[PDB]
Symmetry: C3
Subunit: 229 residues, 3 copies
C-alpha cells in the first residue's frame, strides 16, 4: 500500500485472475482439436498477465532508472507481460486466417523487436536515447499492423465466411488497441512525462485488461474457431 | 571447495556429463525419423543440466537474496536448469501419446509459469510473499500433472500398445518426481528452512539426476519410440 | 564518441540497417509460400543485429567484468545478437536440405549451449574458468559443424540439384565463418588478451556483417528457394 498506484495493479491482478478462471471453465468441454488450440492460446495470456501484475503489485516487477533527472520507477514486468502475451495474440490471428509459416515468423520476430527495443528505451538512462528506441519500437509496430490490416484481410476474405468477418472485427480492435500503447508510453512518465506515474499505470492497466481479457472474450465467443459442423 | 555442498554439485555435474555421453553413444546409429526426435530431446536435457550444474559448481549459478533475516544463497541456475529441461520432458510425453498441438502449448505455458513463478518466490526478499509464488507455482504443477495423469492416459491407451503401457510407467514416474520438487523447496532453506542448504542441494541433485538421466534411460530403452517394424 | 571503437559499432549498425532495408525491398513481391519462409528468416537476422549494434553503439550493450586484474568491458549484447541470429541461420540450412524435425532440435539446442556457455565465460570473473566455458562452447560448435558438414551434405545431395550445390557453398562458408568466432574470442581481450578491445570489436564486426548480411545475400540470390517451376 506504499505506492499511489497499487489500486490499478491490484485491480488489474484481479481482472487477469478472474479472466483466467472464466476461460478455464468455459474452455472445459472442448473436444475439437482446432478449437482447443485457440482455447490454449487465449487462456494462457491472462495467466501470464496475472502473474505479471501480481509481481508489480507486490513490488517485484519494479525498478529505478536514473533518467530525466529523477529516479523514475520502471515497471519492467509490464514489458515482460507484453513480451509474452503479444506473440500469443498474433498466433490467434494467424491460425484464424490460416497464415503460412513464413508470415508467422515475420510477425513474431518483429513483435519481439518491438517489445525488446521498447524495454531498452524504458531502461535507457540517457533521456534523448529513450525516444530513439521508441521510434524503432513504434516502427516495428507499424509493420505488424501492416501485415494484419492488409496481409491477413485478403486471406481472411478468402477463408471461411465464419472467420472472414470475425477477423475483420479483431482487426479493427488490434489496429486501435496496439496503437494506444506507444501513445500512452510517450505521454507517460517513461517518455515525455506529461502524465504522472499513477495515471500511466491506469491507462496501461486498461489497455492490458482489454487486450488480455476483453480481446479473448471476442474470439472464444465466436464460432470462427471449432470445425465446420 | 569453499562451500559445504560443492560435492553434491560436483557429483551432479559428473552425473549429468557422463549421462550425456551415454545418450550420445547410444543415440549414434539411429535412422528412424521418429526415433531421432526422442533421442534429440532426451540427450539435450542432461547437456543443459551439465552446463547448469557446472555453473553452480564453479559458483556462477549462485546469488544472495536478503530474506528471512539472513543472506540466504540462492542457486538461480537450478531453476534455469528446470526452466529448460522440463519443457523437453513434456515434449517426450507429448510425442509418445501423439498429443495434439493445442494440448502441448497449454502444458508448456503452464510449465513456464510454474518455473517462472517458482524462481520469483526464490528471489523474493519478503519472506511471506515467497510462499505466495510457491502456491501459484505448485498449482501450475497440479495442472500439468492433471493433463498428464488423466488427459494423456486415455489417448495413450488408444495409441499403440507399445506406447500405451510405456506411458503408464513414465506417468507414475512423473507424478511422483515432480511432486517431490515443491516439497523439497518448501522444507529447504529457500522455503520454510527446516533443512539446511547443503542437504537441500543434495535432495535437489538426486531429483535432477533422476529426472534428467534416469528418466531418459527409461524412454530410450523402450521400443515405444521408433516406427512399427 | 567516448570509446575508441565506436566507429566499428557505428559502421556495423549502419551495415546491419541498410542490409535489412535491401532484404525488405528485395523481399517485397514474393508469393511462393516456401520462398517467403526463407525471406522471413533472412531479413530478421540483420533486423536483430541492427538493434543489437545500436545498443552497443549507444553504450547500452556494454558492461564491466572484473577479471584478469582489470575492469574489462564486455559487450554482452554481442552474444545476445549471436544468441538470436545463429538459430535462424541454422533454420535456413535446415529448410534448404529439408532436414527432419529431430535434427533441427539438436542443432538449435547445441547452438543455445554454445552461445549460453560462451556468454558465461565472457562474464566469468575467474580468469582460468573463462576458458573452461570456452572449451565447452567450442565443443558445442564442433557438433553443429559436424552435422552441417557431414549430416546435411548427404541429404542435400539427395535433395534437388538446385539446393544440392547451393548448400555446398553455404556449407563451406559456415564451416569457416563459425570457426573464426572462438578464435577471435580467444585472442581478444575477453580471452587471452593478445588483441586489444578496439581491434576485437572490429574483427567481430566483420564476422557479424558477413554472417548476417553477406551470408543472407548468397541464399536469397539463389533459386534453391522458391518452388520447382
Ligand atoms: C497487452 C497486449 C498487447 C497487445 C500489448 C501491446 C503493446 C505494444 C504494441 C507496445 C508497444 C510499444 C511501443 C510501440 C513503443 C514504446 C514501448 C511499447 C512496448 C509500449
Ligand atoms: C529437473 C526435472 C524436473 C522434472 C524438474 C521439475 C521441477 C519442478 C516441478 C519444480 C517446481 C516448483 C514448485 C512447484 C514450487 C517451488 C518452486 C519449484 C520450481 C521447485
Ligand atoms: C553472427 C553470426 C554467427 C554465425 C555467429 C556465430 C558465433 C559463434 C559460433 C561463436 C562461438 C563462441 C565460441 C565457440 C567460444 C567463445 C564464445 C563464442 C560465443 C564467441
Amino acid at each position: 500500500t506504499g505506492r499511489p498506484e497499487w489500486i490499478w495493479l491490484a485491480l488489474g491482478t484481479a481482472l487477469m485472475g478472474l479472466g483466467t478462471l472464466y476461460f478455464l471453465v468455459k474452455g472445459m468441454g472442448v473436444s475439437d482439436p482446432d478449437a482447443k488450440k485457440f482455447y490454449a492460446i487465449t487462456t494462457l495470456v491472462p495467466a501470464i498477465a496475472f502473474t505479471m501484475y501480481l509481481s508489480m503489485l507486490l513490488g517485484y516487477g519494479l525498478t529505478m532508472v536514473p533518467f530525466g533527472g529523477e529516479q523514475n520507477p520502471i515497471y519492467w514486468a509490464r514489458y515482460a507481460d507484453w513480451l509474452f502475451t503479444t506473440p500469443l495474440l498474433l498466433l490467434d490471428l494467424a491460425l484464424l486466417v490460416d497464415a503460412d509459416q513464413g508470415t508467422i515468423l515475420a510477425l513474431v520476430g518483429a513483435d519481439g523487436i518491438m517489445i525488446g527495443t521498447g524495454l531498452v528505451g524504458a531502461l535507457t538512462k540517457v533521456y534523448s536515447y529513450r525516444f530513439v528506441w521508441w521510434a524503432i519500437s513504434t516502427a516495428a509496430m507499424l509493420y505488424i499492423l501492416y501485415v494484419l490490416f492488409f496481409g491477413f484481410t485478403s486471406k481472411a476474405e478468402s477463408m471461411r465466411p465464419e472467420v472472414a468477418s470475425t477477423f475483420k472485427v479483431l482487426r479493427n480492435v488490434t489496429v486501435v488497441l496496439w496503437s494506444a500503447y506507444p501513445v500512452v508510453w510517450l505521454i507517460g512518465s517513461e517518455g515525455a512525462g506529461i502524465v504522472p506515474l499513477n495515471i500511466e499505470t491506469l491507462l496501461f492497466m486498461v489497455l492490458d485488461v482489454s487486450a488480455k481479457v476483453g480481446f479473448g472474450l471476442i474470439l472464444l465467443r465466436s464460432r470462427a474457431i471449432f470445425g465446420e459442423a
